[PDB]
Design a protein around this ligand. Structure first.
Ligand SMILES: *[C@@H]1O[C@H](CO)[C@@H](O[C@@H]2O[C@H](CO)[C@@H](O)[C@H](O)[C@H]2NC(C)=O)[C@H](O)[C@H]1NC(C)=O
Length: 130
């Protein structure tokens, strides 16, 4: 499912993501835009370290979720990577919360550092109601 912009916004707010660990809603909207283009079935495989990135928040299969086929997996989110491909983002949102609680917080999302850090990211929540 490819969420629509505000559709996603209301959803994440409803899910307690706004201001979570100080992180604004638009910031979560910025990283989602650049990580998955709001598509829950988005997956990207790194042939070098041999792990995959699943869904909307593109969560890595070596550290957080489990697909069974990834070398040296930790499964910190205690989830199956299939739970990160559901049209329902409730499971992806809780794990994403787990990621930000580790030492480096939101710096864990590359696209967030490359396209949102120190930028105005308000346009992602404008007209959304939130
Ligand atoms: C993206 O992959 C990087 C590694 O390429 C992950 O970063 C590691 O994350 C854990 C926990 O946050 C740290 O102990 C490591 O030191 C991190 N490595 C680096 C180089 O930062 C990162 O968590 C992954 N992000 C997602 C969303 O899956």
């Amino acid at each position: 499912k490819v969420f629509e912009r505000c559709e996603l916004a209301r959803t994440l707010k409803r899910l307690g993501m706004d201001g979570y660990r100080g992180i604004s809603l638009a910031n979560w909207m910025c990283l989602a835009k650049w990580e998955s283009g709001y598509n829950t079935r988005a997956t990207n495989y790194n042939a070098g370290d041999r792990s995959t990135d699943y869904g909307i928040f593109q969560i890595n299969s070596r550290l957080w979720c489990n697909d069974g086929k990834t070398p040296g997996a930790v499964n910190a989110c205690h989830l199956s990577c299939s739970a990160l491909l559901q049209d329902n983002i409730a499971d992806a949102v809780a794990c994403a919360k787990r990621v930000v609680r580790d030492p480096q917080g939101i710096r864990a999302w590359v696209a967030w550092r490359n396209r949102c850090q120190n930028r105005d990211v308000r346009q992602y929540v404008q007209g959304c109601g939130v």
